[PDB]
Amino acid sequence: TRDQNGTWEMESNENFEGYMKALDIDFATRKIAVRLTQTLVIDQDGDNFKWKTTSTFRNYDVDFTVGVEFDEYTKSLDNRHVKALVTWEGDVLVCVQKGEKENRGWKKWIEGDKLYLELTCGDQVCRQVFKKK
Amino acid sequence: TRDQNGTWEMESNENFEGYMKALDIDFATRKIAVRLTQTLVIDQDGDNFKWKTTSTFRNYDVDFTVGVEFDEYTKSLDNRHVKALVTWEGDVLVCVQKGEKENRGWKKWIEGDKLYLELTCGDQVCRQVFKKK
Numbered sequence: 001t002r003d004q005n006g007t008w009e010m011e012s013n014e015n016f017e018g019y020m021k022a023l024d025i026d027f028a029t030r031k032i033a034v035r036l037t038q039t040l041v042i043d044q045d046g047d048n049f050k051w052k053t054t055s056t057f058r059n060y061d062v063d064f065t066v067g068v069e070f071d072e073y074t075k076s077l078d079n080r081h082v083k084a085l086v087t088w089e090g091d092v093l094v095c096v097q098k099g100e101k102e103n104r105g106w107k108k109w110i111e112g113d114k115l116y117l118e119l120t121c122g123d124q125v126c127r128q129v130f131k132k133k
Numbered sequence: 134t135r136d137q138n139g140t141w142e143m144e145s146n147e148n149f150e151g152y153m154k155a156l157d158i159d160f161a162t163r164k165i166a167v168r169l170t171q172t173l174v175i176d177q178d179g180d181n182f183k184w185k186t187t188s189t190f191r192n193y194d195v196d197f198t199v200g201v202e203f204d205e206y207t208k209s210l211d212n213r214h215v216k217a218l219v220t221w222e223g224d225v226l227v228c229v230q231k232g233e234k235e236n237r238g239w240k241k242w243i244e245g246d247k248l249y250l251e252l253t254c255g256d257q258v259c260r261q262v263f264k265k266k
């Protein structure tokens with residue numbers, strides 16, 4: 001069939017490094033690229049094609065209910081099992097991840113027009129700020 | 134302000150690598166992940182809270198028509214300008230990318246429920262297979 005419509009997810013990718021050197025891509029960029037997965041969405045109207053390719057490194061979704069404990073496996077992150085519980089502290093959403101790591105969790109809150117996020121592990125805190133699209 | 138719904142786009146990241154090292158994420162994954170853009174999607178429905186973090190390297194769109202040559206910019210790819218002609222050899226979508234690289238193009242086709250793609254440049258051939266996610 002010539003119908004190539006659809007969202008496609010890459011399943012196999014060989015000699016991608018050799019092809020990348022043929023285009024003179026620098027070695028640091030080639031290191032990133034070989035670990036990336038690729039999604040390719042084709043929108044086809046006969047001989048008229050439009051397709052988009054996105055290259056991602058690590059996807060990670062989660063779905064929970066506030067105030068209900070849930071088991072969480074952090075695959076593609078650190079690959080640990082934790083017993084997670086998320087509660088509101090006023091306007092701050094607070095998550096504790098009980099497991100091997102001490103002080104493991106995050107805090108997420110709206111301030112003005114922006115989302116702030118603080119990830120914590122042990123004595124390390126990562127602070128992140130997002131703007132809404 | 135507990136409504137955190139939205140598509141959120143990172144504007145700053147503090148101590149991300151220290152956080153990952155606290156998690157024992159290997160050095161190579163930390164080096165890649167810190168060079169990437171992170172997009173956070175939040176679907177919030179009452180007490181049900183779903184978030185989905187995507188870490189993307191590069192994104193690329195194109196629309197064209199079989200039989201028509203067209204100026205093309207491999208934006209976010211290798212970032213070259215080419216003259217691309219996409220034709221049908223049987224039920225195979227073949228492309229030749231004219232420009233300052235010898236023997237550049239690709240071929241794409243369907244068999245069953247899988248998309249086969251071959252990227253060519255110089256003497257290098259890259260083969261990829263996609264599953265219809």
Ligand SMILES: *C/C=C(C)/C=C/C=C(C)/C=C/C1=C(C)CCCC1(C)C
Pocket residue numbers: 058059060076077078106108117119153158166184186188
């Ligand atoms: C409220 C939002 C939260 C808790 C999201 C946090 C995001 C992370 C823990 C991100 C983790 C990483 C990636 C998805 C990419 C690769 C590196 C990781 C594992 C640190």
